[PDB]
Structures are given as C-alpha cells and as structure tokens.
RNA sequence: CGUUAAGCGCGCCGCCUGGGGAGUACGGCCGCAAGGCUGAAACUCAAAGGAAUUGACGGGGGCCCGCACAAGCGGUGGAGCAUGUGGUUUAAUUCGAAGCAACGCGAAGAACCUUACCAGGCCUUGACAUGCUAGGGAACCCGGGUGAAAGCCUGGGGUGCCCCGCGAGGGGAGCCCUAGCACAGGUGCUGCAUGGCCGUCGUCAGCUCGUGCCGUGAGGUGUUGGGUUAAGUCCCGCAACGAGCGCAACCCCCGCCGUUAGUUGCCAGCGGUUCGGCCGGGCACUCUAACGGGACUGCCCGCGAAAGCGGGAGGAAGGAGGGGACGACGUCUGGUCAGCAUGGCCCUUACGGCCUGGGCGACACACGUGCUACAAUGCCCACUACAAAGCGAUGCCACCCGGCAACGGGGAGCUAAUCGCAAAAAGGUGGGCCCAGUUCGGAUUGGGGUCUGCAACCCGACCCCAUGAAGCCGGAAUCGCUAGUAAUCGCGGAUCAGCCAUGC
RNA sequence: AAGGAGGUAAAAAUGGUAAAAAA
C-alpha cells in the first residue's frame, strides 16, 4: 500500500536532514520559502549533470549550498562562467551571501535519485522498459550494491491498463535501519501521460 | 570475545544451532571428497542413503537383514541388524580390520554394558 | 476559479479580515498550517522528502 | 493397470478414423402403438478432447484466531439540542465520498472573504507570466465626477538616465498606454487513460530464492505431518539442507540504577529574615537531558525427547515488561483530475476575471456519529487540596479600577524551567434542597447589554434578568471496552478577526 | 486409533452483473 519514505523514517542516524539550519519560530516560513525556491530554479538549470542531494546551511548570511551533482565537469563551465551566472541569480533572489560548491558523489550507480533519473529518462526517450531497466538493476548490483529494486508505475505503451512493472536483485530490508537504503523517484513523463519511476538501493549493516 | 558483545538470546539461538550442526554432523565434519564406498547398516533407511550413493557411483558396501533387497548393493552382507551384538561382532571386526590395514589392535571395548542392561 | 484567487489575497484588500492563508508549495487555503505557510499535503510531502529541518518522524 | 493385468506373446470376432449435423433423413426388415435395428450425406466451425499442474473461486468440510459469542461494566435507538446525511426544495440551496473500507468524512475555523453555486453591474491581451510588429508616454505622487462595488470619463503634479551638446534634437532602456498578434486562463468533462498519495483486506502470516531429489513435463519439493506461539515463533518428524522480504530486531516514549551537569529544587545541612526559597549558601533530593549498563528461562526445583509448562527466588524489571512509529508479495479497474502534477476532450470578449449582494445554515420527514440529560453514589452556594502537557512579542496579559457580569481605562513582567495564559476538576471540608416535571434537565422564549470585525438580517460567540418544553432512564435491535483498559472528571495545542469546537 | 480406502448417514430462504478489451 504505502511503504512510507524510508527517508521519512531514516531521520534517526541513517538520514541526516537535507537542509541543516536552525530557525526562529516566526521566521521559519519565509526561510524555507526562499530555500525551496533555491532548490527549485536550481532544479530547472543545474539538472544537466544529475542533481541528487542539495545540502543546505544557514547561520546568518551563511547561505552554504553543497550541490551534490553527478559530474560537475561540463557544468562548472570553462573558467567558471556558468557557476558564475548561477551564483549570480542565487544572489539576485537571496538577500544574503551565496555559495555554490559542486560536491558530486564519486560513483554514478549509487544514490537512487540519479539512478531513477537515467531510468525514467530512458523511457522519456521511448526506450525499452524491461530490457534497459533490468540492465539498470543489473548495473547497480554490477557496481557493488547489496540490493536494487526499481518499481515503474504508469501507462507503458498507452494501453489503458497502467501496470506496475517491477524488477529486483539483492536484499532490500526496508524495515531495518542500520542497513541503510537510498531512495529516489524520477517523475517520468510520457508524451502521453505521467508514469512514476522509483528506486531503492541497499548498502549494508554495521554503519 | 563475542561474549559481553551482542545480545544474550542471540547467543542462545546460536547455541541451539550450534548443537544442530554438532548433533547432526557429529561424525561427519571431515567427510571430504567422495568416500569411496558406503558402509551403512540396515540397508533400507540407509538405502535412502544407498540411493544417493547409487547415483554417485559410489560402490555400495552396507549390511542386510531379511526384508531389504540385496541387488541394489554391490558388496552385500547378510546377517542380523536387530541386536547390538550383531553389528558388535561385524563392525568391531571390520574396524580393527581397516586398522589391520593400519596398526594398533587396541582392546575391543565398546558396547557390552548397553549390550543387554 | 484558482489562479486569480491566490492573487486576490497576495495583494491585501481593504479589510484585515479578508486575508486567508496559502500553500505556496501546492496552492490552497484549506488546512494550511500557517506556521509553515504550507497546506497539510504540502506539509507531509516536504517533511517526508527530507526537505524540512527541526521536524522528526515523531514516535512519542 | 499390475497372477481377477490396462504386463510379454498367439488364435478368432466385432468395433474406431475431427467436433458439429445425428444415432437424426431416406430406404429395407421389425412392432397394436410408443418406438427399434440398420445407417449415411450436403452444409458448417478449426477446433472437440483425456488426464494431470497452478490458482482464484465454492449456499462442502476439518483445524485455527479474534469483544465473535459467552462472561461483566457503561451506552447509541426512546426526548431536546450539535454536526454530518438522505430526501425535499429554491433563482442558487456548489461538488466529493456510499455494506463493512462514505455519513463531527476533503472542512484543522464558509457572515462578505473564503467560493467552485445564483440574480445583477461590469472588465476582457485579461487578476497571472511570456515575446514581436508600428505607435505614444519617463517611472510614478495626488484628485474630482460617478456608482452598491468592480468598473468608468477627465484634472494637479510630473520630465531620474546612454550617446552628441554653454544651443536646438532625436533615438535607445526599465516604464505605463491602445490596436493587432503569438497567447494566458478554465476548481469545465475524463481516476475506466495516469503519477503520486491514502484506503483496505491486515501485524493477517503471508510471498519466494538456492543446490539436491521426485515428476516425460507444466510442476512439486522445501512451505504438506504433530505439539506450541502474537507469529511460516520454535521444537520433533522429514528428501532435504538452508537462505531473503515479511514477524521479530536495530528507533522513540514509559518504569531501576548509575557518570557528566546545576539560575528547576531546596535548612535536605548552616546564617538571617519583609520568616513568604524571601535574603546569602549549597548539588544532597526532585527535576531536567544526555552517555551506558540492566533480563537471557540467566538461577533454583518437578515434567516433556526437545520446543515449552508448573513452583520459588534474586530484582525496579519476568518468561513478548506496558505502549508507539513500524505495515510485504498482492487484491480490490477502491478513493482522489476540487491540494498537486497530469494524457486527452473541451469554452476563449466566455465554462475565463472582478465586484456587490444571496446560498453553502432552506423544511411536511428519515438517518449515522455526538453533547446533555431525565436526578439524592445527586443539584446548589462556601473553604482547602494534587495535576501533566502544550502555549504566549506587535502576542501572553497577573494588578488596581469602572462594570453583578459580558468586558472595558490607566497599568508589571515576558525573545519564557525565571514573566502570564491558569481557577484543573472530580476529591475533601461546612451549610441548603427532601423525592417533587423537583433548587431536577435546561430545550425554547422576550425586553434589554459586552466583543470581534467595514459589516453580526439571513448567519457571529458571549452577558443579563424574566421564560422555564420534552425528558420518569429508552421495544426490535445494536456499540464500546481485558488494566490503570472501561467509567467518571478537568486541562491544552493545532487552524483562527471572530466563532457555530458538544468536532478533532 | 496414525493412514489411505470399500459400504451404509447429516449437511444450501433468495438471485439476474454485461464484456470489445491489458501483461
């Protein structure tokens, strides 16, 4: 039925807040408002190289953003003439001191948001669902993971019946904690509908 | 020192399974490679055994009483299986026989107490 | 109507008593927990998706 | 199937050759008749079949569990009020949800706002963004007519900047105006095109992988067998041995102890005192809130092959310690396009947009969840008691005062363990009522008051005093609940001008 | 009794849901 965000349950010692800044009772709103706007217009632009996490810090002008990209290469631009315009606008609609920090994660086939990103985008480019996606779960357990699952729900190929085609390989202990799982859902848009791409990836015990 | 570390009931069930493999794989814990032939007692039960061996092309020695077929075995021994003393004679003999291929001739000792009491 | 409605209050009219809260991450007035300036479904989508500090998937 | 062969062989007879047409047509023999025996075709479909496997299903059954019943304590139905609802109706009474899984449900604050509904006034390159053609205005500060208001016709100001200027000027940009355009927009339909998100079966114990073995194989196995548990929990068996998601565990609240720590607490221990933690002092105790330890059938005894059970203790803690989040594989085309996105269909000076009104609260009934009750284990007035949690800056609001009060005028402290919301109430301790439509119960009713808000008619809460209905403890039926649970009693927060909150 | 089994028993007030069609 539900499943609930592993995330919205991993906020113990397994998922530390995406946005780390204390707030005043009154303040809270407008702060998060500008915040979600940052992530927002960032999303439209700095997608180009897989935007996973978006680490946020705020003390008092301390607008530190640690954009976990996927590969900041052809995204910082030559000499940083693209990091420039982004920090620029960042300042344009943030009445304080901005930060960029392109902290991409070492490895691709980890952190399910970008996994599912490529996943849904393959269907976005019409491609073979079960074939290339089984190849995706494949690639995950071909990277060194411990359990990969990709649910893809919606109008495959049209045909009224919106199935929920599902594939998996490796253990996915969702009721556990220490085990740690990364969850990421891509919002797949068929030219003819909206199908939901979703992925869980397992890591391991002890941590 | 996995003692003070890890929960106590964890130890408990691990002790249970400990004696699972202990009791059930008592003798067998060195049975390596293909064990040449079988030997085995009342040929029926240990013809679930002889079945698996019969497939493995592991020559069948085993010991037989009146009811169970002989031909499924390649090296058959007729005689009683009922009483302790049957396999006492036959096995003890067999054992200081394989150890006749060895050396020791240690006094034939076991059974005798439980042989009737 | 919808689009015009958010604009109706977004610009404060005549009387103080004609303002009504607005989920700026979904767009409604019903059950918008003013503390966050977020509706209830917008609330849960934010807190769940990890994009909300101070909270806790409470278990008290 | 297997010495009663459906086994290995031999003799002989009848009989088979797609399902359907059909054991029917015609013909021959037959019978009192009913009918038989014999026995085809055209045409028509591309399948009809036999077993055996999986699973849904079943008005078959066996075992299993549960407030299912039993066993007890209090209730809904009975009356008045609240809200939800059918129906009913109006110009509109705006939609959604429908046995359980809709009915105090979206709605966690509908007077106009909200608002999607109606009558009317009116705008429409549109309240919103996006860019071009050709034109003008600098942005932009005020005002008059008009009107219910949006809208509408004008009037005072006004002339910041780039280039070329002690001169004249134009073009260019934010910048608004008008035509034209590309467009916006639509809570219009479509959840039977969808995502996501909840429901729900259901914390029900279920769904499977691996090598091996059985089966020509589909596949079975493992997972069917017995005792046991909340449990596919564990043991025993056992052609299997195990392994993963489920159950559990790792997570939090709550109970015992500790170490850090002392503006909460205190003579607990000392001094004094305005004897009131009030003045110094101190960390002992509460507390606070952190980092661990502590419980595993670990110990003791009797039973069972073990899994477990009985009895006893050590201990704050027994046999899962109490709770909470936690909810699989899957079904159900559940619910939702009126939170959002959303494929499509669709109106585009009207299904778009503003305003003012009116409805969402209507009434010949019906229904679910509810508050109160109908009374002496009680109602009433006086004195004292112990709460826990959650709040409070343009808010919390102690205090005197005016007011019987509603609340109003002057007024302290307060970014809070230090200030206030705030009186917990039942308990207890005195006095009244004397069994009565009662000092019961306030349902409703009139002449007046307070508060918020532009505004309280529809349609607000709250105050006064006069009114004081039904109600004598509820038939069929039907609900809750297994321990600090039920029953009883008070308290806060959410969103909110206010408040319909008896709701959550 | 532990089972499989051969003969004799008990056991259902009610109903219509269409179907072009997905993996």
From Swiss-Prot, chain A:
Family classification: Belongs to the universal ribosomal protein uS3 family.
Any one Gene Ontology cellular component term annotated for this protein: cytosolic small ribosomal subunit
Q: How does it assemble?
A: Part of the 30S ribosomal subunit. Forms a tight complex with proteins S10 and S14.
Its protein name is: Small ribosomal subunit protein uS3
Q: What does the record list as GO biological process?
A: translation
Function, in words: Binds the lower part of the 30S subunit head. Binds mRNA in the 70S ribosome, positioning it for translation.
Species for this entry: Thermus thermophilus (strain ATCC BAA-163 / DSM 7039 / HB27)
* Molecular function per GO: mRNA binding; rRNA binding; structural constituent of ribosome
Curated annotation (Swiss-Prot), chain B:
State the similarity comment.
Belongs to the universal ribosomal protein uS2 family.
The protein's job, in short, is: Spans the head-body hinge region of the 30S subunit. Is loosely associated with the 30S subunit.
Quaternary state and interactors:
Part of the 30S ribosomal subunit. Contacts protein S8.
Q: What is this protein called?
A: Small ribosomal subunit protein uS2
In its UniProt entry, the species of origin is given as: Thermus thermophilus (strain ATCC BAA-163 / DSM 7039 / HB27)
UniProtKB/Swiss-Prot annotation, chain C:
Q: Which organism is it from?
A: Thermus thermophilus (strain ATCC BAA-163 / DSM 7039 / HB27)
What does it do?
A: Binds 16S rRNA, required for the assembly of 30S particles and may also be responsible for determining the conformation of the 16S rRNA at the A site.
GO CC annotation: cytoplasm; small ribosomal subunit
Q: Name the chain's protein.
A: Small ribosomal subunit protein uS14
Does the keyword field hold Magnesium?
no
TM spans (from-to): none
Q: Record keywords: Cell inner membrane included?
A: no
Superkingdom of origin: Bacteria
Recorded hits in HAMAP family, A to Z, give:
Ribosomal_uS14_2_B
Obligatory cofactor(s):
Zn(2+)
> Which one GO biological process term can you cite for this protein?
translation
């Amino acid at each position: 039925g539900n499943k609930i965000h592993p995330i919205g349950f991993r906020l113990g010692i397994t998922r530390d807040w995406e946005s780390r800044w204390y707030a005043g009772k009154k303040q809270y709103r407008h702060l998060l408002l500008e915040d979600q706007r940052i992530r927002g217009l960032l999303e439209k632009e700095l997608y180009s190289a897989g935007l996973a996490r978006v680490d946020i810090e705020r003390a008092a002008d301390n607008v530190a953003v640690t954009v976990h990209v996927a590969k900041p290469g052809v995204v910082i631009g030559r000499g940083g003439e693209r990091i420039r315009v982004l920090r620029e606008e960042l300042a344009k609609l943030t009445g304080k001191n901005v930060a960029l920090n392109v902290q991409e994660v070492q490895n691709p086939n980890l952190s399910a948001p970008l996994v599912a990103q490529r996943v849904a985008e393959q269907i976005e480019r019409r491609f073979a669902v079960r074939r290339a996606i089984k190849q995706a779960v494949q690639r995950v357990m071909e990277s060194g993971a411990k359990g990969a699952k990709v649910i893809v729900s919606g109008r495959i190929g049209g045909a009224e019946q919106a199935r929920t085609e599902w594939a998996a390989q490796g253990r996915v202990p969702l009721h556990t904690l220490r085990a740690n799982i990364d969850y990421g859902f891509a919002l797949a848009r068929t030219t003819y509908g909206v199908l939901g791409v979703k992925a869980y990836i397992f890591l391991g015990e002890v941590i | 020192p996995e003692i003070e570390e890890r929960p106590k009931k964890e130890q408990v069930r691990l002790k249970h399974e400990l004696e699972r493999l202990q009791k059930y794989l008592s003798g067998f814990r060195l049975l390596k490679r293909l064990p040449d032939a079988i030997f085995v007692v009342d040929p029926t039960k240990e013809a679930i055994a002889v079945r698996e061996a019969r497939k493995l092309f592991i020559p069948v020695i085993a010991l037989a009483d009146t009811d169970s077929d002989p031909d499924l075995v390649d090296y058959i021994i007729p005689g009683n299986d009922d009483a302790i003393r049957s396999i006492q004679l036959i096995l003890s003999r067999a054992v200081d026989l394989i150890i006749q291929a060895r050396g020791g001739v240690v006094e034939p000792s076991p059974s005798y107490a439980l042989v009737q009491e | 109507a919808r689009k015009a409605l958010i604009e109706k209050a977004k610009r404060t009219p005549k009387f103080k008593v004609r303002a009504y809260t607005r989920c700026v991450r979904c767009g409604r007035a019903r059950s918008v927990y003013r503390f966050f300036g977020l509706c209830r479904i917008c609330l849960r989508e934010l807190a769940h998706k990890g994009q909300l500090p101070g909270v806790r998937k409470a278990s008290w």
